[PDB]
Amino acid sequence: PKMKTHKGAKKRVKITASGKVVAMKTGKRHLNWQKSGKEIRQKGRKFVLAKPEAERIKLLLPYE
């Protein structure tokens, strides 16, 4: 039958208009007290998944 959307990816990830995949930087969930402002600040942005991992994720989002 039809493919089911992987909800774990749908909740972590966005397919941009040109077909890239963007996610939030890992590493600022906790243990932050001794991380510089530069580290906290830069981990607060979105990044672009490397191409091999982006193709696999996009396959899990067939009806976006």
Partner: protein, 99 residues
């Protein structure tokens, strides 16, 4: 799957409202049509007409956006961008907001 290790996906963090029961909040929705997509119309454009012509989708309110040049039309839309209001006004157009 990645051979047993935590996967590339499951190591990225979740973000944003995911919702909860009883589900999606019913609220009005807007689709944007640009002035360029209006040059094929003479006289009066309405949500009815644009929904017919394959431009505007059913169950969506109509918002006029500003990409393109404005033609002196009587355009009846639920909403207008600032640029769409300037361009259409400064061209003999008749913006008719509504609800």
């Amino acid at each position: 799957f990645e051979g047993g290790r935590s996967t590339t996906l499951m190591r990225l963090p979740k973000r944003g409202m995911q919702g909860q029961v009883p589900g999606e909040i019913k609220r009005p929705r807007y689709q944007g049509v640009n002035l360029k997509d209006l040059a094929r119309f003479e006289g009066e454009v309405t949500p009815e007409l644009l929904v017919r012509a394959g431009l505007l989708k059913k169950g969506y309110r109509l918002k006029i956006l500003g990409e393109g040049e404005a033609k002196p039309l009587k355009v009846v839309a639920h909403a207008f961008s600032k640029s769409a209001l300037e361009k259409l006004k400064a061209a003999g157009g008749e913006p008719v907001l509504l609800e």
